[PDB]
Amino acid sequence: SMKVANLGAGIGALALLLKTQLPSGSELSLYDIAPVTPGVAVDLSHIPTAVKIKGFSGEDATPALEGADVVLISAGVARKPGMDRSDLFNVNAGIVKNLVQQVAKTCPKACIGIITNPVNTTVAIAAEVLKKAGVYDKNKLFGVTTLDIIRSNTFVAELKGKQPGEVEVPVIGGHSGVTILPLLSQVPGVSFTEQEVADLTKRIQNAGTEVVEAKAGGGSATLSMGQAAARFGLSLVRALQGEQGVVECAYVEGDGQYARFFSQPLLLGKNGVEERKSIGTLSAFEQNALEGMLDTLKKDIALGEEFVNK
Amino acid sequence: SMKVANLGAGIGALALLLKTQLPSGSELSLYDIAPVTPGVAVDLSHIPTAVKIKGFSGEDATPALEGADVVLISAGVARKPGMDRSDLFNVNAGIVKNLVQQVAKTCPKACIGIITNPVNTTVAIAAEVLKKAGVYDKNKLFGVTTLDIIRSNTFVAELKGKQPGEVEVPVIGGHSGVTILPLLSQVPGVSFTEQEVADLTKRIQNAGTEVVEAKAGGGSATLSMGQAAARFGLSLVRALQGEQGVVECAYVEGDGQYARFFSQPLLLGKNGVEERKSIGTLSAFEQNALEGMLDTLKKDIALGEEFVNK
Lengths: 310, 310
Known about the structure:
The structure is a homodimer.
Chain A: E1 3-7, H1 13-21, E2 27-31, H2 37-45, E3 52-56, H3 62-65, E4 70-73, H4 88-106, E5 111-114, H5 119-132, E6 141-143, H6 146-160, E7 171-173, E8 180-182, H7 194-205, H8 207-214, H9 222-240, E9 247-253, E10 261-269, E11 272-276, H10 284-309
Parallel strand pairs in A: 1-2, 1-4, 2-3, 4-5, 5-6
Antiparallel strand pairs in A: 7-8, 9-10, 10-11
Helix pairs in contact in A: 1-9, 4-5, 5-10, 6-7, 6-9
PDB class: biosynthetic protein
Keywords: InDel design, oxidoreductase mutant, Rossmann divergence, modified coenzyme-binding, coenzyme-switch, biosynthetic protein
Assembly: dimeric
């Protein structure tokens, strides 16, 4: 039986998906500073699935974290391309630090998925916090990049007339702008012109903008983010329960060949990362894009390390 | 082959469930006065399922309605415990009238599910509008009472230690207070003491209050409502596509034995209601509750009829 804790439950799109899709016998806790959160859980408790759900508010996440196997951290303010980002970094960084300290004290053996942006940096914050607490397990800390994958699947399927559900695009690197690297060259049976590669890559890297613009500045990609986080969360749960062949791309502390943290295909298992898989063969376009974004990625990482260690 | 229009999409909980659960090849339109609505659709469009989704704002629902086979109307303000009923009515009545007139003009052959409260009254509004337009088909107009059913299922499964997914409680009558009549006497394999019947019935008739109170007045049962409406909507779509044995309780214009509109078990089919099923044998408690609700139910209905016919 598995327990998932969602810190920063917000409006509860992620919570809704977990309540309806977690296996029978699971438990789900929701925590958010918003005082409505216990009632968000009560709302969901009326849905007749065999998933016990409880909600918590105030400043202490500990009750939601007790016995958690998976912790999904989506607290903070949501990424919104075009928003004046004044103060947003310092705010989310402080939130992640605070929440991960509580995880370290309460459920240090949990798999931890950082959704809170910017993921490239916030994962590094989390790692440093866990290290300072002496409980860091590189195999159990993930930046959730799944949104980039599902966006790529949708766009590729649309361009090439495939069933959206049957397309699976590997996406490596990081979770922001030029650090997002969709491996279009690896999609079987489909071939792209150089122009299509260039156009699709940019669309995927700036997909959030389509949403913000269609909302006339009024919001962001909250529902698809929820869906993406649910996919990742459920993959972790299946793997932790012993299902085999569970593969997801995610941002983890790997061998450090490209950067300290880097998103690559991962076989998940009973202890988190079972195997970090090869990124495979890259086209020239891909190899160049990879090299081109390393300076930005390394800076993102350094920024997070400094937040905790300086 | 099936298009669902959700008028009053709000935050998009219902939209999310439809986007992820509608059969491949479906279409989904969202309409809401909130200017972010086109972008709520764009957000959902990034999820790789074979359901085309488009969103609309402004004052005209027509674009969302073109070619719709199912129309789910959840526009207006949400009902809350202790709220002035005149305020609810004075907002929602005019909204339902306006929206249903547009349905009558654009997609008169659609199945129409009224979620907007108070359902007992708003369905009668809808019927009168459809009649005035000369397109009323009593087999295609439904008040969505499914939330009462899934609440009953959850509470019964908890009390009796049953698998929540295996409990199905028939709920008849209407959608508010004493008009909500769970037929606990008909639940296979389980038996209830008179006290349990009385307690469960009361809990089901006031369930929304649990949520509002746990939210300290800060909101209502939006997520479970979404789930309930998704269940109903998917049942309609499956029946319209020719799936057999699809049974749901809903508030429809029937034989008039109890009231002009009444919620009873319905076999759904290719033209909406295939068969109105008899309510079966009632316990003494149920027979008394049924008689006790008729004055309230008939008044709810009359209020809606008069709103359009005066």
